[PDB]
Design a protein around this ligand. Structure first.
Ligand SMILES: [Mn+2]
Ligand SMILES: [Mn+2]
Lengths: 253, 710
C-alpha cells in the first residue's frame, strides 16, 4: 500500500530513535497544547477507527530503511562456511532498505545495508567520583528519521501535520508519498511496537511498566490496542500499542 | 538392585574389558577378560552385584543358564528382566559409536595423540603430540588404581562415573588409527542410550527385531539460556558479578537435575552442560514429554517472576531413532537431527515467555571462599542461601555436613565425606581470583592500581571460532561427548593453571610488559563452554590473551582458533559499558576473519582495506620485531630512548597522516632513523596485494609500550 512518510530532518543530535508509543505520546501532548483534549479524543477515535503510525526508522538520502521482519530469522537456509557467516550477520541486522524489505516479506533472497546512516556515540562525563554515559545519535549528511502514517488525509492535515510542526519548533518536518509492495497473507509484520490482544507468531519482548511486542514481530490478525490510565496528571493518559501491519509470507515451521 | 540401576551400571561397565585386556591381566578377548575382572572383583570385598554386572562384557542357550546360576531373585530382579538389560546394553554399545598399544588420538587433530595420563587439572596441560604406543605397564597401573576405587565405590552411577572419568578419559575406546573417542565418553553414552531404551519400554524382542533401532524411541533435549550478558553485566561491583555468574550455573543445574530426576535418568544422560547450554538423551514416552512440558513451563514462570524479561530458558526436544545416532550411507544423520533441534530452539527464542498466557494482559547474592559445593534441597529449608526454579541451595562448607538428595561438589571427582544416600554431582568452575590483603576477591580499583605504568582495568572477552561447524562434524553421541567435554575442560579446568604461570615451555615467549607475578592481579568473571570474560591489571590481561591463545593452540592440534576483544578502561567505567566495548571488539575480530585479537583501539582509513584486529601471529611478530628495540621491561624504556621518547610519539603522528589519506606520499618525505627501517620506505608488495603499509600496524606495539612507561 501507499503511506505518508513524515521525514524528521534533524537540526543536531537525537537522544534515541522514537518508537510508535513515544511518537503518539509527543503528538497527543502537542494536540493538547493547540486544540485542547476534545481534539486528543478525536485523535484516539481516528486511531481506534483504523488510522495507524509506524515507529521511526532511519533514512539516508533517497534510501528508506524498514525493520527486518523476524519471519526470515528461522528461514535463512531457504558453501558451508560462507552460509553460517552471512546467516549470523543477517541475524544481527536490525534494518533492511525498502527493496530488500519487500523481498524478505516474500522469503526471496535479499541483501543487508553495508553501513547504517546513524552511529550511537555514548559520551562519558565525571560526577563528584564516577563515570556516566548519555547515548546520542549522530546523523550522517542528508540522513535522519521518518515514520509512516496510514488513514484518512483529513486526520493527517487536522492532527498529525500541525502536531509534528509544533514538535519541530531539534528538527524540521517534510512529508512524501511512500509505496511498500507487500504480499497478501493471513500473517503481518508490525512496523510499530504493539500491545497485542492475541499471542503472536514470532516476537521480541520490549520492556518499558508495559510489555510491548517490538517492531519486526509477526502477528495473525492482531490490531493491538490503546490503553488509557490515570497517573495523577491533569488529564487521563493514552498509551499507543496498535499494530501497523504489512502482509508477510511465513515458512512452514 | 532394580532394572533401571542394572541397565545404567551395565551400560557403564560393558567395555571395562578393554583396559584389562590391554594390561594383559588375563587371557582372551576384551569381552571374556572384562567378565573375569568383575567376577574376580566381586569375590574380593564380597559384593555379588559385580558378578551380576560381569555378564554385560560377554543361540542364547549357555547365557540363560549362566544367568540362572546367579540367582536373580537375590537382587529383586527377574530372569527375563536381566535378558532385556543385556540385549538393551548390546544395541546401546552399537548406537553410542587394531593393536593393543594405540593411544587416544585427539578429536581436535586426529593426526596427533595424547600421552597416557589421568584427568588432573593441577598436573599438566593435555597436548596432542607425536603418536606413541602406550606400554602394557601403564595400563596395568591404571587397572590396579581402577580395581582399588571400584572396591570402595557405592555401586551407584554417580559414584562409578567419577572413577571411570579420572582413569579412562585419556584411553582410546577402540585401538584403531585416528580413533577420536574417549573410553569414558563411549561408556557414559552407552549407559545414557541403554537407560533411555529401557524407559522407552523397549525389550529384548524389540532389540532383536530392531523395533528400537528403526523407530523414534529417543528424545534429544537441548536447553539454551537467553539474556545472559543482560542478566550478568548491566547491573545497578566485581564481587556481585561473580555471584550472578555462579547463580546462573546453579539455576542451570537445578533444571538439568530436575529433568534427570523426573524422567528417571542418570548424570550420564547429560551429553554436555556448558555456557548455559545443555543436551540430554532421554526416552520418547508420552509420560516424558508431559514431564518436560511441566518442567519447561514451571522453570520459565519462575524466571519471569524472579528477573522479568531479562533471563529466558529456551527448552526443546525432538523424537529420534537409533539410526539417527549414527552415520547412514554417507549422511551424518546425528548432525541432521541436531540441526532440526537447533531450528526448534531458534523458533522458541522468537516465542520468548510464550509459555505464560498471562504475558499480554540482591542480598542473598552479595552473601554468595571456604565452601566445597551446595546441597539441592526443598525451597522451604533451614540454611538455603539461594533458590532456583525447583529447589533451594544450601552452601556446603569444609567444617559442616552437606544437606539434600543431590550434593553439587566443586572442582573434584572425589565424593569426599558426604552421606552414602546423597547423589554426588561434580561441577567444574574457573574461579581464579587475586586475593586482597583481606581474604576477599580484589576490586576493579585494586586490580587497576597493580598495573605497570597507566592505572587502567584490563578486560578481555574470548570465544572459539566456528565451534558449531566442528560439533556438526561429530558422527556419533560418544564423539560429540568427547568434543564438548575436552572443549569445556580447557576453559573450566586449565585457565586457572594458565593464569598461575604454568605450561611455560608449551606457551613460550608472548607479548609481555613485566615478569609474571606469583599471585597475578587477575579475576575470572566466567570461563566455560568455548568463552571467557576476565579482568585484571591492564598489562597482565594484555599478556594473558597471548598465553591463553597459545595454550589453546597446543591443546587443539593447532586446528582450532580463538578470537579475543581487549579493553583498557578507567577503573570507574561501569561494567555494562566495559562488557559492550570488549563485545563490539570481539565481534569485530570475528568480522575481519577469525584467529585474530583486538589489541587496542585504533584510528584507520574507512576504505574497507584496513582491519582494526590483528592476526595473532602478525601481532606476535610485530612485538618480537619492535618491542625489544624500545622497551627494557617492567615499566622501563631502553636507555637510548630515555631522552628520545618523543620519537615514539612522532611515529604515531606520522601514522595519523597515513590514516588521513593512505594514498598521499607525505609520510615518506617525513621519515637514529635506523631504529625503524621497515617503516621508512614505501612497501610495494603491499600496494599490489591491496594491503596496508607497515606504518599502519606499528601503533599496536607503540601505544602499549607508552601505557607501560608513563
Ligand atoms: Mn560462544
Ligand atoms: Mn564461538
Amino acid at each position: 500500500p501507499k503511506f505518508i512518510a513524515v521525514k524528521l530532518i534533524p537540526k543536531g543530535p537525537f537522544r534515541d530513535i522514537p518508537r510508535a508509543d513515544t511518537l503518539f505520546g509527543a503528538i497527543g501532548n502537542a494536540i493538547s497544547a493547540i486544540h485542547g483534549q476534545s481534539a486528543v479524543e478525536e485523535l484516539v477515535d481516528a486511531f481506534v477507527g483504523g488510522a495507524r503510525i509506524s515507529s521511526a526508522f532511519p533514512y539516508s538520502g533517497d534510501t528508506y530503511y524498514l525493520p527486518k521482519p523476524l519471519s526470515v530469522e528461522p528461514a535463512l537456509e531457504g558453501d558451508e562456511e560462507e552460509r553460517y557467516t552471512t546467516a549470523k550477520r543477517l541475524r544481527k541486522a536490525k534494518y533492511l532498505d525498502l527493496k530488500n524489505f519487500e523481498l524478505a516479506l516474500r522469503l526471496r533472497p535479499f541483501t543487508i545495508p553495508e553501513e547504517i546512516p546513524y552511529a550511537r556515540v555514548d559520551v562519558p562525563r565525571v560526577v563528584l567520583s564516577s563515570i556516566y554515559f548519555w547515548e546520542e545519535i549522530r546523523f550522517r549528511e542528508k540522513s535522519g528519521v521518518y515514520f509512516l502514517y496510514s488513514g484518512p488525509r483529513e486526520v493527517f492535515d487536522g492532527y498529525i501535520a500541525p502536531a509534528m510542526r509544533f514538535l519541530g519548533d531539534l528538527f524540521e518536518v517534510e512529508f512524501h508519498e511512500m509505496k511498500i509492495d507487500a504480499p497478501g497473507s493471513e500473517y503481518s509484520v508490525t512496523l510499530s511496537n504493539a500491545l497485542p490482544t492475541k499471542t503472536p507468531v514470532l516476537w521480541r519482548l520490549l520492556r518499558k511498566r508495559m510489555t510491548f511486542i517490538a517492531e519486526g514481530s509477526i502477528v495473525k490478525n492482531d490490531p493491538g490496542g490503546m490503553e488509557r490510565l490515570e497517573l495523577g496528571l491533569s488529564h487521563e493518559v493514552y498509551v499507543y500499542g496498535l499494530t501497523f501491519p504489512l502482509g508477510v509470507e511465513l515458512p512452514e515451521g | 538392585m532394580e532394572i533401571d540401576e542394572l541397565t545404567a551400571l551395565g551400560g557403564l561397565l560393558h567395555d571395562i574389558g578393554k583396559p584389562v585386556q590391554r594390561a594383559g591381566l588375563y587371557s582372551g578377548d576384551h569381552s571374556t577378560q572384562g567378565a573375569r575382572f568383575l567376577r574376580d572383583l566381586a569375590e574380593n570385598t564380597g559384593r555379588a552385584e559385580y558378578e551380576l554386572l560381569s555378564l554385560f562384557s560377554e543361540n542364547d542357550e549357555l547365557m540363560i543358564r549362566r544367568i540362572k546360576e546367579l540367582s536373580p531373585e537375590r537382587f529383586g530382579l527377574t530372569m527375563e528382566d536381566v535378558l532385556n538389560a543385556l540385549w538393551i546394553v548390546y544395541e546401546a554399545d552399537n548406537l553410542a559409536s587394531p593393536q593393543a598399544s594405540r593411544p587416544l588420538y585427539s578429536v581436535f587433530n586426529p593426526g596427533k595423540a595424547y600421552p597416557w595420563a589421568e584427568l588432573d587439572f593441577e598436573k599438566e596441560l593435555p597436548v596432542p603430540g607425536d603418536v606413541f604406543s602406550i606400554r602394557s605397564q601403564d595400563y596395568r597401573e591404571l587397572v590396579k588404581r581402577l580395581w582399588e576405587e571400584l572396591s570402595k565405590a557405592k555401586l551407584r552411577s554417580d559414584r562409578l562415573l567419577p572413577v571411570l572419568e579420572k582413569y579412562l578419559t585419556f584411553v582410546s575406546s577402540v585401538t584403531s588409527e585416528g580413533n577420536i573417542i574417549s573410553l569414558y565418553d563411549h561408556m557414559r553414552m552407552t549407559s545414557a542410550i541403554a537407560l533411555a531404551m529401557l524407559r522407552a519400554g523397549c525389550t529384548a524382542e524389540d532389540v532383536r527385531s530392531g523395533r528400537c533401532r528403526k523407530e523414534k524411541r529417543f528424545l534429544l533435549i537441548e536447553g539454551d539460556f537467553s539474556g545472559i550478558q543482560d542478566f550478568i553485566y548491566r547491573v545497578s561491583t566485581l564481587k556481585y558479578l561473580r555471584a550472578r555468574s555462579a547463580y546462573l550455573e546453579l539455576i542451570g543445574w537445578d533444571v538439568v537435575l530436575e529433568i534427570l530426576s523426573r524422567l528417571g535418568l542418570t548424570r550420564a544422560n547429560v551429553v554436555f552442560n556448558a555456557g548455559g547450554h545443555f543436551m540430554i538423551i532421554a526416552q520418547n514416552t508420552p509420560d516424558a514429554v508431559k514431564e518436560l512440558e511441566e518442567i519447561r513451563a514451571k522453570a520459565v514462570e519462575w524466571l519471569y517472576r524472579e528477573f522479568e524479561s531479562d533471563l529466558y530458558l529456551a527448552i526443546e526436544w525432538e523424537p529420534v531413532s537409533g539410526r539417527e545416532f549414527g552415520r547412514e550411507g554417507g549422511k551424518n544423520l546425528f548432525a541432521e537431527a541436531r540441526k532440526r533441534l537447533k531450528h526448534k530452539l531458534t523458533v522458541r527464542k522468537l516465542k520468548r515467555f510464550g509459555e505464560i498466557k498471562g504475558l499480554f494482559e540482591c542480598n542473598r547474592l552479595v552473601s554468595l571462599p571456604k565452601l566445597l559445593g551446595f546441597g539441592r534441597t526443598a525451597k522451604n529449608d533451614a540454611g538455603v542461601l539461594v533458590e532456583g526454579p525447583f529447589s533451594g541451595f544450601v552452601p556446603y562448607l569444609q567444617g559442616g555436613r552437606p544437606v539434600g538428595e543431590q550434593i553439587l561438589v566443586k572442582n573434584t571427582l572425589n565424593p569426599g565425606e558426604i552421606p552414602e544416600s546423597a547423589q554426588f554431582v561434580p561441577y567444574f568452575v574457573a574461579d581464579y581470583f587475586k586475593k586482597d590483603p583481606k581474604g576477599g576477591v580484589a576490586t576493579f580499583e585494586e586490580l587497576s592500581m597493580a598495573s605497570t605504568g597507566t592505572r587502567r582495568l584490563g578486560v578481555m572477552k574470548g570465544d572459539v571460532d566456528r565451534l558449531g561447524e566442528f560439533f556438526s562434524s561429530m558422527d556419533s553421541p560418544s564423539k560429540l561427548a568427547t568434543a564438548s567435554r575436552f572443549m569445556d575442560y580447557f576453559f573450566k579446568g586449565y585457565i586457572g593453571a594458565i593464569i598461575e604461570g604454568k605450561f611455560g615451555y608449551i606457551i613460550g615467549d608472548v607479548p609481555s610488559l613485566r615478569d609474571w607475578p606469583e599471585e597475578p592481579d587477575i579475576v575470572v568473571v566466567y570461563a566455560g563452554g568455548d568463552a571467557f570474560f576476565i579482568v585484571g591489571a591492564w598489562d597482565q590481561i594484555f599478556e594473558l590473551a597471548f598465553r591463553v591463545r597459545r595454550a589453546f593452540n597446543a591443546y587443539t592440534g593447532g586446528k582450532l582458533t580463538l578470537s579475543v576483544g581487549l579493553g583498557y578502561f578507567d577503573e570507574r567505567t561501569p561494567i555494562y559499558r566495559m562488557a559492550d566495548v570488549v563485545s563490539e571488539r570481539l565481534d569485530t575480530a570475528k568480522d575481519e576473519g577469525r584467529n585474530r585479537v583486538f589489541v587496542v583501539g585504533r584510528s584507520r582509513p574507512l576504505d574497507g582495506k584496513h582491519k582494526l584486529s590483528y592476526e595473532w601471529n602478525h601481532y606476535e611478530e610485530l612485538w618480537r620485531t619492535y618491542a625489544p628495540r624500545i622497551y627494557a621491561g617492567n615499566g622501563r624504556l631502553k636507555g637510548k630512548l630515555e631522552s628520545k621518547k618523543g620519537l615514539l610519539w612522532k611515529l604515531l603522528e606520522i601514522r595519523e597522516l597515513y590514516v588521513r589519506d593512505p594514498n598521499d606520499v607525505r609520510w615518506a618525505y617525513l621519515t637514529l632513523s635506523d631504529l625503524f627501517p621497515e617503516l621508512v620506505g614505501i612497501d610495494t608488495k603491499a600496494v599490489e596485494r591491496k594491503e596496508p603499509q607497515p606504518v599502519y600496524w606499528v601503533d599496536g606495539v607503540l601505544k602499549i609500550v607508552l601505557m607501560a612507561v608513563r
